[PDB]
UniProtKB/Swiss-Prot annotation:
Catalytic activity, reaction form: Selective cleavage of Tyr-|-Gly bond in the picornavirus polyprotein
Protein's recorded name: Protease 2A
Whole sequence portion shown: 869 to 1008 of 2193
Binding site for Zn(2+) 1: C50, C52, C110, H112
Taxonomic superkingdom: Viruses
Regions annotated as coiled coil: none
Length: 140
């Protein structure tokens, strides 16, 4: 589990979005596993605006933050998980590291702020849904 709180936006994995998120929907994309909902309260998270490929992510299943190198956001084939079939996922960054389904929502951060959230796992890789291209999260 986990979310990004930027301005009046809540960013979550689409597969973990609640009824309240859908009832306050701003934007969603299945291919990216992202959904954004509107919030009453101001969030303080800063979204990274950068092309960093090193950062730190939170792994709930190990109660640890791990420094990682990660690929640039790409269209990648993802094997079946407990929450998605085998399919292509877009805007996905991969690192070597641990990721269980419950780790989805863990933040990946670089010196510039929040890069993305854990979205995929398996075969000793962790995949992150990038948010750094969603420049509109910074405004409205
Ligand atoms: Zn950065």
């Amino acid at each position: 589990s986990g979310a990004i709180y930027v301005g009046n936006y809540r960013v979550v994995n689409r597969h973990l979005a609640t009824h309240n998120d859908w009832a306050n929907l701003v934007w969603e994309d299945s291919s990216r596993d992202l959904l954004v909902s509107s919030t009453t309260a101001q969030g303080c998270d800063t979204i990274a605006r950068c092309d960093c490929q090193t950062g730190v992510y939170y792994c709930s299943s190990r109660r640890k933050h791990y420094p990682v190198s990660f690929s640039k956001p790409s269209l990648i084939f993802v094997e079946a998980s407990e929450y998605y079939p085998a399919r292509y996922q877009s805007h996905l960054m991969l690192a070597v590291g641990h990721s269980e389904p419950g780790d989805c929502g863990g933040i990946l951060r670089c010196q510039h702020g929040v890069v993305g959230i854990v979205s995929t796992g398996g075969n000793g890789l962790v995949g992150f849904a990038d948010v750094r291209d969603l420049l509109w999260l910074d405004e409205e």
